[PDB]
Structure 1
Amino acid sequence: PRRRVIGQRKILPDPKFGSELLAKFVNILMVDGKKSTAESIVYSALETLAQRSGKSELEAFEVALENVRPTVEVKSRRVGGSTYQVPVEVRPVRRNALAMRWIVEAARKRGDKSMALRLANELSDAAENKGTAVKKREDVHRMAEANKAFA
């Protein structure tokens, strides 16, 4: 907005696992307003990732999200002239949501078998740092530190 402060309530924690981040991930991954399909797909991918990596269930995806989160983002700014890519500081929640969106879109663009396996593959290659989410992730880091004096 422009005058009134806003803030959204907190979605319910993810069923059984109780992961608020996982509940937010199903929100982002949701399509056409169908939580059942999103929940089934996320659980299938989560168990596949856990059994493939030999890691636990809760933090197996936490590692990938930690390793695919950025630090600064370029904001199109033009005070006197044309557009300047001015990098800025990323808020905590904004960083988390941006990494989550990156993972979801990276899984979207794949074609391996189906969402259940594509999400697991994205998580694995994000843990390893050889995926496409990470490939897009390093771009902001390389484009940072361009124009500081401007604001």
Structure 2
Amino acid sequence: SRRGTVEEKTAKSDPIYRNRLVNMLVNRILKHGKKSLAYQILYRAVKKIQQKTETNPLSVLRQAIRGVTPDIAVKARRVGGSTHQVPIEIGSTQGKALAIRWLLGAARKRPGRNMAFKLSSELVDAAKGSGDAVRKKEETHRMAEANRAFAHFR
């Protein structure tokens, strides 16, 4: 990636809901490229989240990702022979990426039975701000602010 940058790729829409977001999450949930299974898992997650609460799940998505989206993180810099943690600010696409990822990660580590149950458990816990995927983001902020002194681009 030294020379050429990256051209933009078509942002798709999930077939049932016509969403860019839901399609993002069904792509990141994917393993061994069986879309057949991923769509099923995610739709039964929407089914259990509409089962547990009567609120529109289309909104619980935006609450879940607004909830776990880091606005800042750190990065390792080599400056003056000193190895620094420098709080580099995060782009939007990268924010949604990180979001979906810690969500999915904490979703794969749950004690439960199905994956639809786990994903719904964690969308329910992130939309209230009540769980590991929000906690993780807040830790990234805690370690961003303790290191706030090392950003000279401030």
TM-score class, shorter-chain normalisation, is: over 0.9
SS of the residue 2:7 aligns to: coil
In the TM superposition, what are the counterparts of 1:63-78 in structure 2 within 5 Å?
63-78=63-78
1:10-56 per-residue CA deviation (whole Å, 9 max, x = no partner) reads 24210111111110111101011111111000111012112212111
TM-score (norm 1): 0.93
Q: Does 1:108 align with 2:108?
A: yes
SS of the residue 1:84 aligns to: strand
1:92-112 per-residue CA deviation (whole Å, 9 max, x = no partner) reads 111011101111111011121
- Aligned residue number for residue 148 of structure 1: 151
- Contact kept in structure 2, 1:13 and 1:19, CA below 8 Å: yes
The one-letter amino acid paired with 2:61 is: F
**Structure 1 residue 82: deviation in Å?**
4.0
SS of the residue 2:74 aligns to: strand
SS of the residue 1:6 aligns to: coil
Unaligned runs of 5+ in 2: none
The one-letter amino acid paired with 2:151 is: K
In the TM superposition, what are the counterparts of 1:1-151 in structure 2 within 5 Å?
1-145=1-145, 146=147, 147-149=150-152
Alignment length (residue pairs): 151
Could you tell which deviates more after superposition, 27-36 or 75-84?
Answer: 75-84
- Contact kept in structure 1, 2:69 and 2:96, CA below 8 Å: yes
**Structure 1 residue 136: deviation in Å?**
0.9
**Structure 1 residue 150: deviation in Å?**
6.7
Separation in structure 1 between the aligned mates of residue 2 and residue 53 of structure 2, nearest angstrom: 47
Report percent identity of matched pairs. 41
CA RMSD in angstroms comes to: 1.6
SS of the residue 1:88 aligns to: coil
SS of the residue 1:58 aligns to: helix
Separation in structure 2 between the aligned mates of residue 150 and residue 59 of structure 1, nearest angstrom: 36
- Contact kept in structure 1, 2:14 and 2:23, CA below 8 Å: yes
- Contact kept in structure 2, 1:69 and 1:99, CA below 8 Å: yes
**Structure 1 residue 83: deviation in Å?**
2.6
- Contact kept in structure 1, 2:60 and 2:124, CA below 8 Å: no
- Contact kept in structure 2, 1:68 and 1:137, CA below 8 Å: yes
Unaligned runs of 5+ in 1: none
- Contact kept in structure 2, 1:86 and 1:150, CA below 8 Å: no
